[model samples]
Target chain A: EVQLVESGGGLVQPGRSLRLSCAASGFTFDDYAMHWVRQAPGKGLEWVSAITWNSGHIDYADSVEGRFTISRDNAKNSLYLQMNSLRAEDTAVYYCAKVSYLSTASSLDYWGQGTLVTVSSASTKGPTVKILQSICDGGGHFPPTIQLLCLVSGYTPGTIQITWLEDGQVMDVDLSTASTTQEGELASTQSELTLSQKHWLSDRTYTCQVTYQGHTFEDSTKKCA
Target chain B: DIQMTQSPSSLSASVGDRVTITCRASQGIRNYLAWYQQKPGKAPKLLIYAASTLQSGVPSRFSGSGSGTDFTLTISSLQPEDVATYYCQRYNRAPYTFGQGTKVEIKRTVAAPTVKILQSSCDGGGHFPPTIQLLCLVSGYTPGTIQITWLEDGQVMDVDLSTASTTQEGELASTQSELTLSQKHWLSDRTYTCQVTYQGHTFEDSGKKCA
Candidate 1:
C-alpha cells in the first residue's frame, strides 16, 4: 500500500536538538522533495519547508527556518528532519511530507504518522495530558449567549468544523477561534464557540462537537447554577 | 507581499483556446510573483514565478508579466493536456496565498506555444499520470547563446529529466522544460538547479523543490 512511513520517539531536553526520520520504501525519494511539517503540542498544521533529494536544495517555510533542517542520506534512502534549540514550547508532533503535484497547486499528499517530542524533565510514557475548560451562560439580558471553549495538550492539522447539537439535532452555530504551536508533543489547538440563539440555549440540552480527519470528539458542559 | 484576486472563480476553456489570468496586488509587489499548476496526484510545478522567470525545462507559451501591482499569467496557445486549473502565488512575503484557480478545457484560442525538447524523463513513455501536469520554470538570465542545465541533487544540473525550450524576451533569454513525475517519483522536497550561460557570462538561480 502507499505509505509515508515514519518513526516514533520521545526527546526530553531544552538545548538538545531532535532529529526524526521518514523512510520511503515503496517509492523513490529521488522523484520528490521531502517536506517537514509541525504541529505544536496543540495547534494547526504549519508548513516548515522542503528539501530536494537530488539537489539538497532546502526551502524553509519562513521564520521557522532558524530551528529546522531537512536532510537526506541517499545511501540509506531515508529522509530526515532536525529541529534544534529545543524548548518546552517545541513539544509537539512533527510530520514528514512528500510533495504531491497537481494541476492547480501542490500539497503534501503523503504524510508520516507523527513524532512527539517533549521538553520537560517530568516525562513518563506519552504526551502530556491536557484538560479543556468551558462554560455556558444562558438567557442573561440579551438574545441568549452560549460560550464554549476548546483546550487540549496538542492537535496537528487542526482544521475544524464546529457544530452544536440539541436533543440530538444539529442546530445553527456561530464560532470564532485561534490556534498556536509550542514545541514538543504539546501542540495545542484552542477555540471558542459562541451562539446567540436565546430559546435554543435556554433548553434542549446542548453539546459541542470537534471534528478532525474523519473522527469527531465532543464535550458537553451544563450551564452555570 | 502581494494579494492576488482571480476572476470567474471557475471557467471552462478548450484545446487551442487562448487563456488569460490577471493578478492584482494590494501594493506594488515588484515582479516578484509566480504561477503554479496542480492537477490531481502530482507535485505543484512552477510555470512562471518572479515576473517572467520561466523555469528551465518548461514551455515558452506560458508567459508571465506585470512587474508592480498588476500582473498577469497568460497562455498564448492551449493544448489538450493544458486542461487543468492554474493558480498565482506571490513569494514577496510570509504566509503566501494562492489564487483560487482557472480551469482550461478543450477549446482553442490563440496559437498554443510550441514544445521543443531539451530533455525528458525516460519512465512511463514520458507520459504523466492523468491528474498530474508535467511542467517547470526558472529565471535569472539574459538573452544570448545560453547553456541551460538541470540540478538533480547537490547543485549539479546534469540529470536529464525531459525536453526544454528556450526563447528570447525583452533584454533577457528564457528556457523551458517538461517532464512527468509519476507514482514512481513519489514525494519529498526534490531539488532541481538551473544554470544559464550567455554572452560569456554565466548566471544562475537557486534550485527549486517540489513541495
Candidate 2:
C-alpha cells in the first residue's frame, strides 16, 4: 500500500527556481529509490533524475544535468527536486515514482500525482469544467447508481480544488480525480462521484465545483429518470 | 542511447483477443527496458520493467518478454478495460527514449469527443509568440476511427494543425488536436472550430467567444 503524493508546483518566472516535493508513505524511504519523470505538454515522457539514498548515487539526464538536483530528506520520508535557471521549455508536469529492484528485475511500482511547473509571466485562470452524468445499475436490492464526473481542463499551474455537493449542501463523498498537464502550460483533471441508487434518489441535486487560482467554476446534474 | 521503435502504431481489437506489440531497439539493451500504459489525459504507468518483470497488481494477462535488441508486450486476453497506448523505453543508457506508442482499441461502445477551445491567454501564460491553441479531447470511445480537424473563419485550416497520439481509458479513446495561431489572428474577431469525426459521426466545438 505504498502511497506517494506530489505537491509544490506553481507559476515561476523565467530564470527563477522552484522545488517540487514528493512525500512517500507505507514503506521505508531508504529501501527504495525515487526517480523524477516529466512530460512536456503534448510531448513524450522524459526521465529527469534519480536518487538512491543507500548508495548516495544521483543520476540526471543530460538535458537537465546542470539545472536539476534530486535530493532526499530521510527523516521526512520525502524526496525533493530543486530546479534552477528555469526556461520556458522547462515548463512541464513532473512526477515522482518509486523504483524497486529485486535480484533479477527492477520497476517503478508507485507513482505520485504530477505537479505542473509553469514558467511564464502571464496571468493564469482557474479551470473551466463541465459535469457529465450517467447511471450504472447495481444489484442485490441496490438502485441504479449515479455517476457525476467533472471534466476540468485548460487551466494553468496544475492545481485545483474540487468540492462535491448533494442537495445544495456539502456531503462527505469519496472523490477520485486524476490531473495531468497538457502542452507545457495547460492542465486538466477528471473528478468523479459515484453513489448508490438509494442515495442518488434521496439527493436529487448533485453539484461538482472546482476552484483554481482564486476563481470558482461549477456544474450540477439532476437525478436520472 | 538505445532507440526503441514500436509497431502497429494503432490497432483495433475486442475483449478476449490476444494482442501482441513489438518493440525493436537500435542496439542490445540486454532486457534493460520497460513497458508503460498511458491512458488519455494522464501520465504513463509502468507495466513491465527489466523486460519481463511485471509491476505489482498489474493484471496477469499483461506480460512482456525479449532481450538484446527486441522486445514484445503481449496481452494474453485483452479485457475491455485494457484499452490504452503502450510504449517501450530503453533504460540501458542515459537520455532514455521511448517508442512512439501503440494505441489499442477495444471493440465495444463508442463515446464522443469532448471539445474545449482555449483562448490566447492559455498559451503558456506568455507575452511572446502569442499563440492560441484549441484542444479536442476524444474520450470514452471505442473502435478507434477518429479524426480531428480545424476550421478558421469557416474555412478548413488543415495546414498547421497538430494532433497528439491518442491514448485510451478502459474501452474508450482520448486524444487532443491542437491548432496554434498567432495572437494577432486570435484578436481579429475570427471564429475557429474544432471538428472531430469518430465512428462516422462528426462533432464540432466553436471558439467564437474564446477571445
Candidate 3:
C-alpha cells in the first residue's frame, strides 16, 4: 500500500536548470530516507543523492556535488531533485528510491517507476498520449484476455507508467511485451496490459491512464452496448 | 565496497543434520550481511539480515553470526524442506554483492575435469633466461576436489594451479595451472603434459613444444 509518483522532467536546453519531483503516499514520509539514482542511455546505475529520514541529512555524489540539490517537504510528503548547469550528457532516467532502515544491510527497496530528463537546445514540452483497446482469445501460453495499449509518444527521455481503472477503481493487470523506441529526439513508449476477457466484455468502463511527468493522460472505453 | 564468496559449495547432508555455510568477504562488512534460502517450488526467501537478526516470521532454527568479513549461517536441524540453496549477501557498499549460493544436495556425485594444455611464452622477454609457461586450463568438473599433476617429457615438474572460477552454469568449475620451463626445451621440441585427477577419473592433456 505504498507508492512514489514522480513527475517534472522534460526536454531542457543545455546550460540551464531542471527539477524533478516524487510524491509519496500510503506511508509516513518522514519515517524513511529517500534517494536519487540515475542511469544514462544503457548505462549502469549512478547514485546521485540521498536524504536521511527524520534527520533531514543530505548527501550527494561528488560528480553532482555543486549542481545537485536534494530536499524534501515533510508536510507535503514529497521529495525533489533540482539540478543546475545541465549538460547534453546529463540525459538520463532519474529515479526516486526509499530505504526503511538506516543500517548498512538496509536497501533502497521502494522505487518510483522513473522520470526521464533530456537536455538539448529544445524546449521542455509535455507528452502526446493515446490508448487502444482490443480483445484476445485464449492462445498458447496465454489465457483469453483483453488488451489495452497505452502509447505515450513525443515525450522527451521516454519514461511512462500505465495504470488501469475499472469504474474509477484501480484494477490489477499483467504487463506484456512493453517497448520504448526513439522517434528522432523525443521518444515513444508502447505499454500493454492484459486482463480477463470476461471482465472486458462486461458492460463496464475501463480506463487506460498513462502517467508521464506529473500530468494524467488517459482514455476510457467500454463494451459498446 | 566488499565482495563476498561462499565456500564448500554444493555440500550434501542428511535430513535432521546440522549444516554450516560460510560466506567470506574481501574486506570487512561490519555485520552488513543477509542470508537467503530457496529451492525449486519455493519462493526465494531472505532468512536473516544484519548478521543474526531474523526476518519477520522466519524459522528460529536458522541462525547467523560472525559479524565480520567472515559471516556464517548455521541451521540447527536441517529439515527436508531446508535442502535449498543458501546464499550470503553484503550491503555495506554500492551495488549489493551476493555470495555464490551453497546448494544443499541430497548426496554427492563426481564429474571428471576436462583438461587442455596451451603454450604461452613467459613474460621473461628474452632479457634473461626465456621460459615458456605451459597453461593447462582444467574445466568442466564437479565436486571441485581435483588434483593436478604435470610432467615434462616423462619427468615430474612443479605446477602452479590457481584461479578457480566458473565459466559454465552451476559448479562446472575451471582452474588455471601454469608450468614454467626453459625456452630451450620448447625449441628443443620437448613435450609437456598435465593430468587432472578427480575421484576415479584421470584426464590427461598434452602440449608439444614448438619453435
Q: How high is the CA lDDT of each candidate model?
A: 0.52, 0.70, 0.65
lDDT per residue as tens, model 2, A56-135: 67788878889988899988998999999998888777889887663112556667757777777777766777664441
**Candidate 1 vs candidate 2, TM-score winner:** 2
Tens digits of per-residue lDDT, candidate 3, A1-225, equal 777767787767778898899999988887887878775664434567877776446777767879989999888999999989888878777878776475424755556656778776654456775454441111212234655555567766644555667787666332443555554676666666675767654656766676654457776655432
Give TM-scores of chain A for all candidates: 0.51, 0.69, 0.72
**CAPRI band for model 1:** incorrect
Give me the candidate number with maximum lDDT.
2
lDDT of 1 by residue, A1-225 (tens): 445655543645787776788877667766776666565632434456667657445677655558877788777778887778777766656667665542112444456555555565553322221112211112113223544444433454323334446556554322444433343443444444565656424634545554433345665543322
User: Which RMSD values do the candidates have, in order?
Assistant: 28.0, 12.3, 21.0
Backbone clashes in model 3, listed as residue pairs? none
* Best candidate according to DockQ: 2
- Two-chain DockQ for model 1: 0.01
lDDT string, candidate 1, B1-211, tens digits: 3346665555556665677877766776676666766442122456776668777666877898888877777777877656666766654543344565665555334331222211121111223233221343443344445555645454553346556665454333445555444444523435444454555655543322211
The better-scoring model by DockQ among 1 and 3 is 3
lDDT of 1 at A120: 59
**Span of ten consecutive residues with least summed lDDT in model 2 chain B:** B119-128
Q: Once superposed on the true structure, which residue ranges of model 3 sit more than 4 Å away at CA? A: A102-105, A122-143, A150-190, A201-220, B1-27, B30-211
The predicted structure with the larger DockQ, 2 or 3, is 2
Clash count (model 2, backbone only): 2
Clashing residue pairs in all predictions, respectively, total 87, 2, 0
